[PDB]
Amino acid sequence: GALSGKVALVTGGSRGLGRAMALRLARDGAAVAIVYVSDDSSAKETQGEIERLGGTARSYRCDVSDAEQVTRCVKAVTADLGPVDILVNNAGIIRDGLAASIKDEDYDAVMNTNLKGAFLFIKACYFGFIRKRSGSIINISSVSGVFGSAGQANYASAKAGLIGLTKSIAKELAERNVRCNAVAPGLIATDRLDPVPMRRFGRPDEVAGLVAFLAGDESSYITGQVVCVDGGMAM
Amino acid sequence: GALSGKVALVTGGSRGLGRAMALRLARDGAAVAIVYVSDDSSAKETQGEIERLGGTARSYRCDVSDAEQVTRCVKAVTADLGPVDILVNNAGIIRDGLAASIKDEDYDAVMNTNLKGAFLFIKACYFGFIRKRSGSIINISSVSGVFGSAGQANYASAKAGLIGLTKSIAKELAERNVRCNAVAPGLIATDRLDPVPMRRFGRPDEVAGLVAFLAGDESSYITGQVVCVDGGMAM
Amino acid sequence: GALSGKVALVTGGSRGLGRAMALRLARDGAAVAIVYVSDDSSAKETQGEIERLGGTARSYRCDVSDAEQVTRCVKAVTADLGPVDILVNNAGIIRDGLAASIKDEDYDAVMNTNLKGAFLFIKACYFGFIRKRSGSIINISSVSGVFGSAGQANYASAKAGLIGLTKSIAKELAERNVRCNAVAPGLIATDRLDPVPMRRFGRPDEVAGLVAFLAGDESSYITGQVVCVDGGMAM
Amino acid sequence: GALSGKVALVTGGSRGLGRAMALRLARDGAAVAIVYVSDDSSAKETQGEIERLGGTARSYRCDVSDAEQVTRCVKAVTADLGPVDILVNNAGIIRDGLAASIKDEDYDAVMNTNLKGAFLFIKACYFGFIRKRSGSIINISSVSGVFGSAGQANYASAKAGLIGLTKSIAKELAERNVRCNAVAPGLIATDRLDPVPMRRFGRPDEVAGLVAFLAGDESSYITGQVVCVDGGMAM
Numbered sequence: 001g002a003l004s005g006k007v008a009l010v011t012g013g014s015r016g017l018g019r020a021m022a023l024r025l026a027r028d029g030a031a032v033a034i035v036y037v038s039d040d041s042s043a044k045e046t047q048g049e050i051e052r053l054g055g056t057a058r059s060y061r062c063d064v065s066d067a068e069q070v071t072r073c074v075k076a077v078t079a080d081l082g083p084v085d086i087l088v089n090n091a092g093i094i095r096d097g098l099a100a101s102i103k104d105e106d107y108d109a110v111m112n113t114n115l116k117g118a119f120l121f122i123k124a125c126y127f128g129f130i131r132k133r134s135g136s137i138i139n140i141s142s143v144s145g146v147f148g149s150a151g152q153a154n155y156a157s158a159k160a161g162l163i164g165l166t167k168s169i170a171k172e173l174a175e176r177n178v179r180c181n182a183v184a185p186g187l188i189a190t191d192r193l194d195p196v197p198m199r200r201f202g203r204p205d206e207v208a209g210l211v212a213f214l215a216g217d218e219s220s221y222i223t224g225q226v227v228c229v230d231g232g233m234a235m
Numbered sequence: 236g237a238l239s240g241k242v243a244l245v246t247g248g249s250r251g252l253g254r255a256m257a258l259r260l261a262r263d264g265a266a267v268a269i270v271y272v273s274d275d276s277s278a279k280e281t282q283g284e285i286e287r288l289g290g291t292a293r294s295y296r297c298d299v300s301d302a303e304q305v306t307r308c309v310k311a312v313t314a315d316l317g318p319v320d321i322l323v324n325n326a327g328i329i330r331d332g333l334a335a336s337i338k339d340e341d342y343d344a345v346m347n348t349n350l351k352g353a354f355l356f357i358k359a360c361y362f363g364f365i366r367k368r369s370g371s372i373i374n375i376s377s378v379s380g381v382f383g384s385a386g387q388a389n390y391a392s393a394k395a396g397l398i399g400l401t402k403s404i405a406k407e408l409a410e411r412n413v414r415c416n417a418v419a420p421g422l423i424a425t426d427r428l429d430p431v432p433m434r435r436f437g438r439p440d441e442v443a444g445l446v447a448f449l450a451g452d453e454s455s456y457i458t459g460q461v462v463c464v465d466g467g468m469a470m
Numbered sequence: 471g472a473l474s475g476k477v478a479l480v481t482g483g484s485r486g487l488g489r490a491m492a493l494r495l496a497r498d499g500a501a502v503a504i505v506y507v508s509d510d511s512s513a514k515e516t517q518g519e520i521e522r523l524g525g526t527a528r529s530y531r532c533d534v535s536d537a538e539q540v541t542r543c544v545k546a547v548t549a550d551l552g553p554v555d556i557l558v559n560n561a562g563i564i565r566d567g568l569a570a571s572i573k574d575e576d577y578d579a580v581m582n583t584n585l586k587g588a589f590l591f592i593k594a595c596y597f598g599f600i601r602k603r604s605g606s607i608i609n610i611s612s613v614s615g616v617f618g619s620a621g622q623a624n625y626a627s628a629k630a631g632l633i634g635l636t637k638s639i640a641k642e643l644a645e646r647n648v649r650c651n652a653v654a655p656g657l658i659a660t661d662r663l664d665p666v667p668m669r670r671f672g673r674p675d676e677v678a679g680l681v682a683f684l685a686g687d688e689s690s691y692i693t694g695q696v697v698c699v700d701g702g703m704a705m
Numbered sequence: 706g707a708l709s710g711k712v713a714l715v716t717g718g719s720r721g722l723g724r725a726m727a728l729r730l731a732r733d734g735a736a737v738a739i740v741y742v743s744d745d746s747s748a749k750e751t752q753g754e755i756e757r758l759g760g761t762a763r764s765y766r767c768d769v770s771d772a773e774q775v776t777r778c779v780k781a782v783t784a785d786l787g788p789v790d791i792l793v794n795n796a797g798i799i800r801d802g803l804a805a806s807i808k809d810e811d812y813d814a815v816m817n818t819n820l821k822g823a824f825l826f827i828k829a830c831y832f833g834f835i836r837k838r839s840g841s842i843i844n845i846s847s848v849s850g851v852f853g854s855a856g857q858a859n860y861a862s863a864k865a866g867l868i869g870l871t872k873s874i875a876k877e878l879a880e881r882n883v884r885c886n887a888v889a890p891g892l893i894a895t896d897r898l899d900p901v902p903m904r905r906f907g908r909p910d911e912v913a914g915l916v917a918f919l920a921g922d923e924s925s926y927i928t929g930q931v932v933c934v935d936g937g938m939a940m
Contacts, residue, residue, distance in 0.1 A: 067574050098596075098642065099589070099592055099593060099596060099638070099639060099642060100593050100596040100597060102589065102593065104537050107586070107589060111581070111585075115581075115627065115631065116577070119569070119572065119577060119623070119624070119627070122569055122623075123569060123570050123572065126568075126569060126570040127570060144634075144638070145634050147637055147694075147940055148634060148635075148636070148637020148638035148639075148640065148641050148694065148940065149637075149638055149641060150638065150641040150642040150902075151638075151642060152638060153589070153592075153635055153638040153639055153642065154589070156634045156635070156637065156638040157585065157589070157631040157632070157634040157635040157638065158631065158634075159634060160630050160631050160632075160633050160634020160635070160637070161585065161627040161628065161630050161631025161634065162627070162630075163630050163634075164614075164615050164618060164626045164627040164628075164629060164630020164631065164633075165618075165623055165626070165627040165630070166618070167470055167617055167618020167619075167626065167630070168569070168614070168618035168619055168620065168621075168622060168623040168626040168627065169569060169618075169623055170432065170467050170470060170618065171432050171467060171470070171618050171619060171620040172568065172569060172620040172621060172623065174432030174433045174434070174466065174467050175432065175433065175434050177433070186456075194899070195900065197405065197406050197409030197410065197458070197459070197855075198409045198410065198412070198456070198458065199409070199410050202456040203456070206455055206456040207456075209452075209453035209454065209455075210453070210454070210457065212453070213448045213453060213454075217444075218444035218445070218447070218448060219444065219445070219448075220441055220444075221421075221433070221437040221438070221441040221442075221464050221465070221466055222445065222462070222463070222464055223432070223433065223466065223467040223470070224432070224463075224467040224470025224617075224618065225462060225463055225470065227457070227460060227462055228457070228459075228460055229456050229457055230456070231409065231456055231458065232405050232406060232409050232458040232459040235402055235405060235406070235458070235459025235460065235852055235853065302809050333831075333877065334824070334827055334828060334831060334873070334874060334877060335828050335831040335832060337824065337828065339772050342821070342824060346816070346820075350816075350862065350866065351812070354804070354807065354812060354858070354859070354862070357804055357858075358804060358805050358807065361803075361804060361805040362805060379869075379873070380869050382705055382872055382929075383705065383869060383870075383871070383872020383873035383874075383875065383876050383929065384872075384873055384876060385667075385873065385876040385877040386873075386877060387873060388824070388827075388870055388873040388874055388877065389824070391869045391870070391872065391873040392820065392824070392866040392867070392869040392870040392873065393866065393869075394869060395865050395866050395867075395868050395869020395870070395872070396820065396862040396863065396865050396866025396869065397862070397865075398865050398869075399849075399850050399853060399861045399862040399863075399864060399865020399866065399868075400853075400858055400861070400862040400865070401853070402852055402853020402854075402861065402865070403804070403849070403853035403854055403855065403856075403857060403858040403861040403862065404804060404853075404858055405853065406853050406854060406855040407803065407804060407855040407856060407858065429664070430665065432620075459852075459853065470617055470618065637940055640902065640937050640940060641902050641937060641940070644902030644903045644904070644936065644937050645902065645903065645904050647903070656926075667875065667876050667879030667880065667928070667929070668879045668880065668882070668926070668928065669879070669880050672926040673926070676925055676926040677926075679922075679923035679924065679925075680923070680924070680927065682923070683918045683923060683924075687914075688914035688915070688917070688918060689914065689915070689918075690911055690914075691891075691903070691907040691908070691911040691912075691934050691935070691936055692915065692932070692933070692934055693902070693903065693936065693937040693940070694902070694933075694937040694940025695932060695933055695940065697927070697930060697932055698927070698929075698930055699926050699927055700926070701879065701926055701928065702875050702876060702879050702928040702929040705872055705875060705876070705928070705929025705930065
């Protein structure tokens with residue numbers, strides 16, 4: 001009871017980090033829309049989880065890369081739970097490999113799911129955010145999006161591009177009191193620690209904590225920021 | 236009741252931002268030690284405030300620049316409320332002017348109150364933090380410490396130096412599960428908005444929110460970070 | 471006579487910044503390949519310029535977005551002038567507008583010309599660079615790619631993504647002594663200054679200077695960096 | 706013959722990195738003033754070196770920490786070689802140790818030699834720079850000043866503070882066409898490589914290259930920047 005029945009849309013909330021985010025957001029009192037590729041099993045399992053502990057949630061199988069199968073999905077969300085106050089872009093495909101083994105298949109998959117998706121969902125929710133004078137957009141940006149990483153040029157470019165998006169949107173909506181920030185997780189279980197000063201993996205609910213903080217009113221004057229959750233990895 | 240009766244030490248908690256921090260930390264259920272230069276009136280007024288709404292607090296007039304009048308103050312705190320889990324370095328003097336009008340008086344005042352103080356308090360609390368395997372150190376770093384500012388070379392250098400301290404400590408204590416992070420407030424009332432995208436000043440309790448988040452268990456995997464609260468100013 | 475007859479490939483060297491880069495690189499004694507969309511007039515005018523003052527140069531009309539019409543172009547370059555030592559990615563389309571007026575046409579044009587192109591050219595030159603133990607890749611990254619910009623979410627995302635690419639490649643090739651860096655120009659004539667501390671536009675040959683430095687042996691231990699040429703704009 | 710007989714002042718140019726800088730600056734055709742603690746032997750050896758290969762140079766034993774024994778030194782320089790166009794702050798003491806073993810002796814030595822010195826020399830040269838409408842100030846900022854380092858909290862704070870100084874001065878002098886930038890060297894021989902992607906130490910003349918570039922007219926639109934020379938270490 002800290003989100004006050006607001007509506008959160010978590011793309012790629014199917015599983016893992018997104019699942020922790022959806023669970024957390026719901027437990028703070030927000031109706032969560034779970035958008036996914038996706039296996040429907042994990043998604044309705046996530047919703048069943050949110051409901052089991054008394055939270056409001058819905059699921060939406062959507063292609064985040066389609067220019068607006070997204071819009072269909074978004075005003076479906078708006079119809080079902082109401083206008084979006086919180087948008088979490090977590091949809092993303094990983095396809096590693098040296099920049100010379102990288103392929104258009106890999107490249108465009110990664111780029112469309114990790115970067116384009118955010119563009120299209122932000123496009124969909126943009127006039128609502130503005131007409132409301134409130135809003136918190138949270139993009140998932142990888143620590144490899146902050147300082148790069150070998151053999152992940154395609155994923156890392158997508159995540160860095162996501163950070164650029166975050167900044168530009170934040171500047172774009174700042175005067176209409178709509179915030180946009182980025183989250184840069186490091187090494188996270190679940191499914192090496194040398195450059196990680198804390199010498200341990202992170203848990204998803206630790207990332208979920210940061211998403212929840214960025215989504216609430218405690219971060220009302222924070223916008224355009226890139227916050228790592230990496231155990232100090234990319235400090 | 237979210238700090239669980241832990242102990243927070245807020246240097247420069249006399250007034251303004253520090254006061255909002257002390258108030259906030261206390262309201263989340265932490266015994267707060269208010270360390271100040273300082274006018275005692277505002278400090279015991281802050282404590283009287285914390286107490287009035289049922290919080291635990293003490294005041295300590297200390298010179299943050301003395302090499303260890305600080306230590307006296309710190310184990311006074313430890314004697315009175317207990318070992319420190321949360322350390323907030325907010326002590327700081329501002330003395331503006333073009334780098335050629337800057338004076339040793341100004342320079343050393345700013346540098347000792349804004350930078351040295353943090354060094355000495357971190358020195359004091361350092362073995363406690365380590366022996367406990369827990370800890371959250373929050374340094375106040377100005378947005379002018381992030382991208383500089385004209386006519387504030389002396390203050391800005393102090394704040395940037397504070398960010399360097401933050402990083403080095405975070406690396407230094409990471410394996411013993413002690414976090415260290417920096418907060419970079421922008422334009423904050425109370426006592427021009429063109430480079431501020433949100434086109435408004437910030438309120439102190441908005442900065443206090445970020446300090447509280449960085450102090451709790453929601454930021455347990457965050458360390459070595461520099462988070463602005465500037466309305467997007469230094470994004 | 472400071473490039474020693476090495477071979478530089480400048481995509482988008484048709485005109486403007488790219489033209490200044492090609493001219494400069496040539497004047498330091500490098501055979502320059504001018505790759506462009508492009509109007510052929512400006513390109514062969516650029517080559518005619520390089521030749522007029524005694525430099526070696528060739529032109530290549532290529533689609534930087536085609537997955538490898540690029541490769542055809544690149545081993546054309548290799549056939550004509552020799553293996554590439556210096557790669558400058560300057561190809562880029564600008565299509566501004568609020569993130570809700572942004573269109574797939576705009577979006578994919580910007581993203582493919584500004585980001586994908588770099589991927590494909592780096593792909594093409596990658597084994598040459600490695601087999602040689604030398605190499606300097608210079609990506610053009612905008613200052614709007616560093617801190618974002620309103621109404622340029624699509625361009626800014628592309629440029630930030632370019633910075634992520636730069637980092638990942640630098641890490642990827644570092645051990646084989648191949649450098650990769652990014653250049654972030656600010657406001658540049660030729661064809662407002664408030665956030666620009668120097669209170670003036672930049673000239674293209676000033677950016678060209680930085681490209682030339684990053685291309686030579688004076689920057690042999692510099693890699694993975696993002697250097698602004700913005701009059702302090704994004705400091 | 707690329708500095709055109711301008712005057713460069715290199716504090717801590719006694720030895721090592723500073724020596725490479727003084728040598729390099731001189732070879733590009735600049736009269737170099739070698740300011741040092743210092744052993745006079747190495748300094749006049751450096752000058753003897755510059756002279757041996759036909760360069761103009763002078764030496765000045767000065768306490769960079771004295772508030773203005775510095776000024777005496779600076780208008781000595783001005784008397785001997787002429788007004789300063791280039792200022793390189795390289796004076797610095799290193800005294801490592803965990804933040805709890807750090808001592809006022811250590812702390813103030815490091816802070817005064819690494820940070821205060823820059824303040825005082827910039828103070829001395831500031832009206833000359835302004836009256837001339839030209840100028841390049843180069844501060845040496847360590848890579849540990851960029852992302853911190855364990856057991857070097859005191860040195861790292863000094864170097865980060867140096868970066869803050871750089872920014873503030875750059876903003877402060879930008880309109881009078883005086884540039885200020887920072888150099889962040891990584892692991893440099895002469896007198897472990899895991900976080901260094903290039904898997905090798907750097908040579909001093911590689912850092913000297915960057916200083917020379919930042920000192921000339923090739924970087925005329927670059928100001929307020931922090932450029933690493935670390936083999937990608939702090940990318």
